[PDB]
Amino acid sequence: VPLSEKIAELKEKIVLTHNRLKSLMKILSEVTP
Amino acid sequence: FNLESRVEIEKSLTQMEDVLKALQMKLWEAESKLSFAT
Amino acid sequence: SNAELFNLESRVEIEKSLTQMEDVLKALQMKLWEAESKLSFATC
Numbered sequence: 001v002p003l004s005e006k007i008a009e010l011k012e013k014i015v016l017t018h019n020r021l022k023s024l025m026k027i028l029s030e031v032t033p
Numbered sequence: 034f035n036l037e038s039r040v041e042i043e044k045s046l047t048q049m050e051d052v053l054k055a056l057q058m059k060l061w062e063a064e065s066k067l068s069f070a071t
Numbered sequence: 072s073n074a075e076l077f078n079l080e081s082r083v084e085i086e087k088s089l090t091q092m093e094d095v096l097k098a099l100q101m102k103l104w105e106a107e108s109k110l111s112f113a114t115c
Contacts, residue, residue, distance in 0.1 A: 004067065007060065010093065014057055017096060017099065017100055017103065018050075024110060029043075031039065031113075032039040036105060042106055046106065049099055053096075056092055059088060059092055063085050067085055070077070070078045071078075
């Protein structure tokens, strides 16, 4: 079941990193028209 | 994977999103292989 | 038991790509960080 927990911890990080990337994409398009 | 220019940051950030999009499918695939092996 | 064998082959190939995903993402997180510092300093 440690594999089950390694899945969940890895999922939340994909999500968090995905959110950082999203916020940076909005900041970047404010200055690249 | 360049950050010299705004145009390259843009290209590079989409590549990173495409990489995460591949990771999310790999995570799901692992979720199912595991669920099927218990 | 081919079942127990199959189970073990699964759990091996599972946690292999788990570490693989770990290595792919944390390099990704490092270049992300570089871009964050770039656009952060640039837009102050």
